Design a protein around this motif. Structure first.
Motif, PDB file in Angstrom:
ATOM      1  N   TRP A  37      -5.726  -2.270   7.750  1.00 14.26           N
ATOM      2  CA  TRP A  37      -6.092  -3.210   6.700  1.00 14.26           C
ATOM      3  C   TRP A  37      -7.402  -3.895   7.059  1.00 14.26           C
ATOM      4  O   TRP A  37      -7.620  -4.274   8.213  1.00 14.26           O
ATOM      5  CB  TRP A  37      -4.996  -4.260   6.487  1.00 14.26           C
ATOM      6  CG  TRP A  37      -3.720  -3.697   5.941  1.00 14.26           C
ATOM      7  CD1 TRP A  37      -2.744  -3.051   6.639  1.00 14.26           C
ATOM      8  CD2 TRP A  37      -3.280  -3.735   4.577  1.00 14.26           C
ATOM      9  NE1 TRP A  37      -1.723  -2.681   5.797  1.00 14.26           N
ATOM     10  CE2 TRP A  37      -2.028  -3.090   4.525  1.00 14.26           C
ATOM     11  CE3 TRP A  37      -3.823  -4.251   3.396  1.00 14.26           C
ATOM     12  CZ2 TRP A  37      -1.311  -2.946   3.340  1.00 14.26           C
ATOM     13  CZ3 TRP A  37      -3.109  -4.107   2.220  1.00 14.26           C
ATOM     14  CH2 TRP A  37      -1.866  -3.461   2.200  1.00 14.26           C
ATOM     15  N   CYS A  80      -6.797  -0.888   1.686  1.00 17.64           N
ATOM     16  CA  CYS A  80      -5.837  -0.252   2.578  1.00 17.64           C
ATOM     17  C   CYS A  80      -6.424   1.059   3.079  1.00 17.64           C
ATOM     18  O   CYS A  80      -6.852   1.897   2.278  1.00 17.64           O
ATOM     19  CB  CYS A  80      -4.503  -0.006   1.866  1.00 17.64           C
ATOM     20  SG  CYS A  80      -3.325   1.004   2.792  1.00 17.64           S
ATOM     21  N   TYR A 112      -9.836  -6.730  -0.945  1.00 17.52           N
ATOM     22  CA  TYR A 112      -8.882  -6.211   0.023  1.00 17.52           C
ATOM     23  C   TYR A 112      -8.737  -4.709  -0.172  1.00 17.52           C
ATOM     24  O   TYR A 112      -8.882  -4.194  -1.285  1.00 17.52           O
ATOM     25  CB  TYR A 112      -7.511  -6.893  -0.109  1.00 17.52           C
ATOM     26  CG  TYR A 112      -7.554  -8.399   0.025  1.00 17.52           C
ATOM     27  CD1 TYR A 112      -7.764  -9.211  -1.085  1.00 17.52           C
ATOM     28  CD2 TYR A 112      -7.380  -9.011   1.259  1.00 17.52           C
ATOM     29  CE1 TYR A 112      -7.804 -10.587  -0.966  1.00 17.52           C
ATOM     30  CE2 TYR A 112      -7.417 -10.388   1.387  1.00 17.52           C
ATOM     31  CZ  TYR A 112      -7.628 -11.171   0.271  1.00 17.52           C
ATOM     32  OH  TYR A 112      -7.666 -12.540   0.393  1.00 17.52           O
ATOM     33  N   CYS A 121       0.869  -1.175   0.000  1.00 22.88           N
ATOM     34  CA  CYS A 121       0.000   0.000   0.000  1.00 22.88           C
ATOM     35  C   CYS A 121       0.907   1.227   0.000  1.00 22.88           C
ATOM     36  O   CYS A 121       1.329   1.705   1.055  1.00 22.88           O
ATOM     37  CB  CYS A 121      -0.947  -0.011   1.203  1.00 22.88           C
ATOM     38  SG  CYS A 121      -1.912   1.504   1.421  1.00 22.88           S
TER      39      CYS A 121
END
Ligand SMILES: *[C@@H]1O[C@H](CO)[C@@H](O)[C@H](O)[C@H]1NC(C)=O
Ligand SMILES: *[C@@H]1O[C@H](CO)[C@@H](O)[C@H](O)[C@H]1NC(C)=O
Ligand SMILES: *[C@@H]1O[C@H](CO)[C@@H](O)[C@H](O)[C@H]1NC(C)=O
Ligand SMILES: *[C@@H]1O[C@H](CO)[C@@H](O)[C@H](O)[C@H]1NC(C)=O
Ligand SMILES: *[C@@H]1O[C@H](CO)[C@@H](O)[C@H](O)[C@H]1NC(C)=O
Ligand SMILES: *[C@@H]1O[C@H](CO)[C@@H](O)[C@H](O)[C@H]1NC(C)=O
Ligand SMILES: *[C@@H]1O[C@H](CO)[C@@H](O)[C@H](O)[C@H]1NC(C)=O
Lengths: 110, 272, 227, 241, 108, 213
Positions: free
Chosen positions: F152, F197, F195, F138
């Motif tokens: 996260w 960040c 996913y 990230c």
């Protein structure tokens, strides 16, 4: 490269005053120790007095009195004064310089 | 470090009357069932005193640098421990010996150095999101100090960091004096259930802290602590909650006082 | 004069670290020689000093009899020895030169300072680094610019000289430092800014050189075809 | 931490420590039966616990047994002129004791050095730590170790086979300085056992009154020390024990 | 307080012999002894100092070894040029030198 | 240790900043003086002042110190850009029988035009799945070192394993850039849906979500 010149010795009465003269060519008189060692004729060496780099001087037990040391920085010479003398003062001397606990250089004798 | 504030609408101070308040022990001797008259600095009975408001519901913050004469009388109806300490000084420019009182959550720190003093030093308490309690995290009292040989730590005390807007449950009294150069602090905790118009009950003040400091302290300033909750944006510019606090600043006068002692050895009544 | 020390050194947790501090442009004369360490995030500690003209040492009370410091008048160098290494001892050392004076204070002041020796302890041994290409996606390239680079993993130590096209590119090159991990591994990153018009005619490669590991790999980077 | 020290400072680099904000008694120090040098001038051991000074300093340096007498102000030598100078108006004295067990190993203990060469008289209460090359000749010395160029510091041979006068003695010297400032460190006073039910006089921090001491049934508030009556006479005093 | 006594007074040795001159002290002194050679009619000259070190101008044929009480001035090869007396000198804390007796070496 | 120093100090380019180093009476309160040393972040420490009254060659006249009682003070005539360095006080300790340095203080005088945090998310490539490991990077650029916390999430539960932060490195245009790593396994890489960040900076948050499939 160290040389010392001594003078002033001679015949004098015990009830008299004399001035000794010790000079150093390549050494100064106000920055190092100097020992006044007197050796009797036919006997061993004997310490008498010592002069420090400062304004302090010391003498032995037998010669504690009647001794005066006054260095001169103008002519790079060392002066010693004796007001009184005894019959045991007949001895040879070598004005010399040395470090702590030992001395290496030496000089002549009168 | 310190920051400046912004102009806002404030409330002017009011005047209220004291009722048998500001009487302490003038000596350290024991007197039983006698009536002793002493000449010292005491708060006059039924005298006009100033009222300083610190409640939020608005945004009342008024800590002016009041002059310190020969003896003052600081009385606070403390409930949630809004008023924490006091700062003393003469010129407040790192030139004289300045006095600082702080009653922190761990121990009372009494240090006398040239701490410097901004226009409005204060303590900020921040409400953590994860922890359901109040923790003091904004430590803005002084910038730096050069030298001091005096450093005294008093007995530890437990302080409550939670602030509310309910009625008060305790009364706190503080008396500051300066004779010969010695510092005198008189305090005693008294429980009462009132907001204003203090009752005519009597309660003497015992000396607590005595220090030999060569200070002149011609002026003094109190400290007010606010809260940083989720309602406020978090900036000390225009929005803050100060809880509910009200403190009075009295002036001691050289008046002769007659003290009444009981068999136990405590002051019961006083006559001016 | 100026004093020179040894280079970077890495060892095991429980070995003996050996360093020296040499003098350039002259000897130590009669001034004493001392050593002062410096840890990241902490202050500077004093462990001992050496008298080079008499060959004697004066240690500190904090450090016990595990360190012997000597000096040689023939080569005019400072000789330092430390044993029983620990993971705490990750500090760098400098050789201090003291210049005293005559007065009421009589506090030793460090006049000359060495360059500094970097000493670190690591239980992990030397392994082979792995480099894998990184390419931007279609959604990331919103405008006419694209971001791409190469990633270095399981490499030791952290200082690595990374160059783009053997140093032919200097604009948009950024160097990132490593970071600690649970297993002690290190990882850097590198990203450059290039126009999208040069992605179909110019191929970007990464050259990574590892001097202690005696390895040098060449890898190419290609854009993704699915996105 | 000064007497029972793990290590001892050098003669030229003697450590200086200042004690204050407490009281200091010399009765336990006198009865240790281990100190062979306690000749003191100006003050007396009997009056040492009565008067006091603004601050007390401590000096730590280890010398041989022949130089413990040299610490007197009216002494000359390599120690009394080049290592430590004591003023003629110095208040205090020198405490020394035998240290044959410590400061010595199988070989020569060359861990202690002292000044040997100096071009001027040292000032009183001054410490000099100089690592310059000493010179005696007219030609300047550029830090070389040639002729007429020697290190001023001389090593000490602390062998266990040396004599009593050459044995290394741990020397701690106290310094008494009294100024116009209020005293911070003084001597603890006496605490005699109280005698009740007897016509005795006392000094209870505010008065000198004679009379019997009888147990009472009235308790004091925990902030008062004195006590008065109707006739304003002290008749109730708290013993601080 | 300190008396420096030398056991040998007159010892005769050949060229290939060790003179083995020793000096004794009432009080133990640790490696602070110096030896001298005074020719008849000539100024004395230092030979060794601190009982272990050697001077630059002094030839290395001289040697000395003594910890606290027993010292020696053993010479590997005796030369005819150096036939004079020897003295053991130990100083004090006040730079009070103490010169002992003289031991003479003669040709057999 | 036995020497107490302030943790950090602040100032302005044109005002006077005084740093005070106080210690015990055995070292500071005794007859020993103090010695100041300056250590820039990247070069060896160098001598600044000895003897509390004298100055060396090459040291500017703006560096002046004073000793008063059981403390040592310094006077600085203006702060420059090269003054951003650690400051220590060294004095001889009688009890320690050796030199002891101070606690150290940080004098930071700097200012940068901080802006909104621009973050980027690079999903791992297909060739990284055969290495039996999965790393997530990230990268964040054009941001201030303050408020560097990185979180996260996997849209169902926060990840508390393999998270870290990195000290940013100064760029060539007065900017700082850093990156974060997340160690995962290829077996559980395809189990989650997405996913992301999360970086929080002065109350502003930017969410970037990538789709592995
Ligand atoms: C006290 O203050 C009030 C104002 O609230 C005023 O009306 C009153 O006259 C004052 N009394 C005295 C005695 O000053
Ligand atoms: C409370 O405040 C005092 C001075 O204001 C400070 O010395 C002390 O460290 C503080 N306590 C805590 C726990 O922060
Ligand atoms: C305090 O103020 C008074 C009057 O202003 C003055 O006489 C006195 O000297 C001052 N004391 C100090 C310590 O400044
Ligand atoms: C004071 O002490 C007396 C005697 O013990 C007791 O009777 C009285 O209640 C005490 N006073 C108070 C207020 O408790
Ligand atoms: C110092 O050590 C000795 C022996 O180790 C012991 O007898 C003595 O009590 C200690 N303390 C003092 C103050 O002498
Ligand atoms: C004084 O010290 C003694 C020590 O034996 C102790 O028992 C006593 O309680 C002390 N007195 C106090 C603390 O008032
Ligand atoms: C403390 O420092 C100030 C200067 O900042 C000085 O005026 C004052 O005399 C000092 N105090 C003492 C006790 O030295």
């Amino acid at each position: 490269e160290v040389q010392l010149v001594e003078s002033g010795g001679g015949l004098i009465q015990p009830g008299g005053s004399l001035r000794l003269s010790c000079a150093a060519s390549g050494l100064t008189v106000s920055s190092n120790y100097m020992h006044w060692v007197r050796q009797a004729p036919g006997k061993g060496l004997e310490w008498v007095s010592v002069l420090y780099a400062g304004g302090s001087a010391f003498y032995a037990d037998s010669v504690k009195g009647r001794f005066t040391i006054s260095r001169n920085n103008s002519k790079n010479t060392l002066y010693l004064q004796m007001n009184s003398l005894r019959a045991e003062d007949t001895a040879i001397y070598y004005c010399a310089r040395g470090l702590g606990d030992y001395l290496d250089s030496w000089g002549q004798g009168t | 470090q310190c920051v400046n504030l912004t102009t806002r609408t404030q409330l002017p101070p009011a005047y209220t009357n004291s009722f048998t308040r500001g009487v302490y022990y003038p000596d350290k001797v024991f007197r039983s069932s006698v009536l002793h008259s002493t000449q010292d600095l005491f708060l006059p009975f039924f005298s006009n005193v100033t009222w300083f408001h610190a409640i939020h519901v608005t945004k009342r913050f008024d800590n002016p640098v009041l002059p310190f004469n020969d003896g003052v009388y600081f009385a606070s109806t403390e409930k949630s421990n809004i008023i924490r300490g006091w700062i003393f000084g003469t010129t407040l420019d790192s030139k004289t010996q300045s006095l600082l009182i702080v009653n922190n959550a761990t121990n009372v720190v009494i240090k006398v150095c040239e701490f410097q003093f901004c226009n409005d030093p204060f303590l900020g308490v921040y409400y953590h999101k994860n922890n359901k309690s109040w923790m003091e995290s904004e430590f803005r009292v002084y910038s730096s100090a050069n030298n001091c040989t005096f450093e005294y730590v008093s007995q530890p005390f437990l302080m409550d960091l939670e602030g509310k807007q309910g009625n008060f449950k305790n009364l706190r009294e503080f008396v500051f004096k300066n004779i010969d150069g010695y510092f005198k602090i008189y305090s005693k905790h008294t429980p009462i259930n009132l907001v204003r118009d203090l009752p005519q009950g009597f309660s003497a003040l015992e000396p607590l802290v005595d220090l030999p400091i060569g200070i002149n302290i011609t002026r003094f300033q109190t400290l007010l602590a606010l809260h940083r909750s989720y309602l406020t944006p978090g900036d000390s510019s225009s929005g803050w909650t100060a809880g509910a606090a009200a403190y009075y600043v009295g002036y001691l006068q050289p008046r002769t006082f007659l003290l009444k002692y009981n068999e136990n050895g405590t002051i019961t009544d006083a006559v001016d | 004069v100026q004093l020179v020390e040894s280079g970077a050194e890495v060892k095991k947790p429980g070995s003996s670290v050996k360093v020296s501090c040499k003098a350039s442009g002259g000897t130590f004369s009669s001034y004493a020689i001392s050593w002062v360490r410096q840890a990241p995030g902490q202050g500077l500690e004093w462990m001992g000093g050496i008298i080079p003209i008499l060959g004697i040492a004066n240690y500190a009370q904090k450090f016990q009899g595990r360190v012997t410091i000597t000096a040689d008048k023939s080569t005019s160098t400072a000789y330092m020895e430390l044993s029983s290494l620990r993971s705490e001892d990750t500090a760098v050392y400098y050789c201090a030169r003291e210049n005293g004076y005559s007065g009421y204070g009589a506090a030793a002041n460090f006049d000359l300072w060495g360059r500094g020796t970097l000493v670190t302890v690591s239980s992990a041994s030397t392994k082979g680094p792995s480099v894998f290409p990184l390419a931007p996606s279609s959604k990331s390239t919103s405008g006419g610019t694209a971001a791409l680079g190469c990633l270095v993993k399981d490499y030791f130590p952290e200082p690595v000289t990374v160059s783009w096209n053997s140093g032919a590119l200097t604009s948009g090159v950024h160097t990132f430092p490593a970071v600690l991990q649970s297993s002690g591994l290190y990882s850097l990153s590198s990203v450059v800014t290039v126009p999208s018009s040069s992605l179909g005619t110019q191929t970007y490669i990464c050259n990574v050189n590892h001097k202690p590991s005696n390895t040098k790999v060449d890898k190419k980077v290609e854009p993704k075809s699915c996105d | 931490e000064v007497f029972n020290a793990t290590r001892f400072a050098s003669v030229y680099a003697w450590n200086r420590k200042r004690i204050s904000n407490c009281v200091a008694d010399y009765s336990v120090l006198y009865n240790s039966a281990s100190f062979s040098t306690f000749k003191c001038y100006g003050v007396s051991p009997t009056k040492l616990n009565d008067l006091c000074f603004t601050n007390v300093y401590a000096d730590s340096f280890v010398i041989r047994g022949d130089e413990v007498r040299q610490i007197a102000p009216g002494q000359t030598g390599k120690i009394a002129d080049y290592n430590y100078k004591l003023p003629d108006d110095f208040t205090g004295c020198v405490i020394a004791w035998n240290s044959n067990n410590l400061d010595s190993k199988v070989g020569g203990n060359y861990n202690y050095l002292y000044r040997l060469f100096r071009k001027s008289n040292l000032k009183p209460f001054e410490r000099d730590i100089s690592t310059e090359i000493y010179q005696a000749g007219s030609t300047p010395c550029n830090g070389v170790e040639g002729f007429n160029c020697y290190f001023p510091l001389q090593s000490y041979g602390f062998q266990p086979t040396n004599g009593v006068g050459y044995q290394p003695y741990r020397v701690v010297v106290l310094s008494f300085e009294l100024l116009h400032a209020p005293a911070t460190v003084c001597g603890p006073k006496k605490s005699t056992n109280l005698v009740k039910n007897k016509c005795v006089n006392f000094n209870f921090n505010g008065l000198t009154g004679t009379g019997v001491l009888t147990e009472s049934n009235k308790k004091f508030l925990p902030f008062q020390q004195f006590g008065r009556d109707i006739a304003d006479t002290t008749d109730a005093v708290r013993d601080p024990q | 307080d300190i008396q420096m006594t030398q056991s040998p007074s007159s010892v005769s040795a050949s060229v290939g012999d060790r003179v083995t001159i020793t000096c004794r002290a009432s009080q133990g002194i640790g490696s602070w002894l110096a030896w001298y050679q005074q020719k008849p009619g000539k100024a004395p000259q230092l030979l060794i100092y601190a009982a272990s070190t050697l001077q630059s101008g002094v030839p290395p044929r001289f040697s000395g070894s003594g910890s606290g009480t027993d010292f020696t001035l053993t010479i590997t090869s005796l030369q005819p040029e150096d036939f004079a007396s020897y003295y053991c000198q130990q100083a004090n804390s006040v730079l009070a030198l103490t010169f002992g007796g003289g031991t003479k070496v003669e040709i057999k | 240790s036995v020497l107490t120093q302030p943790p950090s100090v602040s100032g302005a380019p044109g005002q006077r900043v005084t740093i005070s180093c106080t210690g015990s009476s055995s070292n500071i309160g005794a007859g020993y003086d103090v010695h100041w040393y300056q250590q820039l972040p990247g070069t060896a420490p160098k001598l600044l002042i000895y003897g509390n009254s004298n100055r060396p060659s090459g040291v500017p006249d703006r560096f002046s110190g004073s000793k008063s009682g059981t403390s040592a003070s310094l006077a600085i005539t203006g702060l420059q850009a090269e003054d951003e360095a650690d400051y220590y006080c060294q004095s001889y300790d009688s009890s320690l029988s050796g030199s002891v340095f101070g606690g150290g203080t940080k004098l930071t005088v700097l200012g940068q035009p901080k802006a909104a945090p621009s973050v980027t998310l690079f999903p791992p490539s297909s060739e990284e799945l055969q290495a039996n490991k999965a790393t997530l990077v990230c990268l964040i650029s054009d941001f201030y070192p303050g408020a560097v916390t990185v979180a996260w999430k996997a849209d169902s539960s926060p990840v508390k394993a393999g998270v870290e932060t990195t000290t940013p490195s100064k760029q060539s245009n007065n900017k700082y850039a850093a990156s974060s790593y997340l160690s995962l396994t290829p077996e559980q890489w395809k189990s989650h849906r997405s996913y992301s960040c999360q970086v929080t900076h002065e109350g502003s948050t930017v969410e970037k979500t990538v789709a592995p499939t």
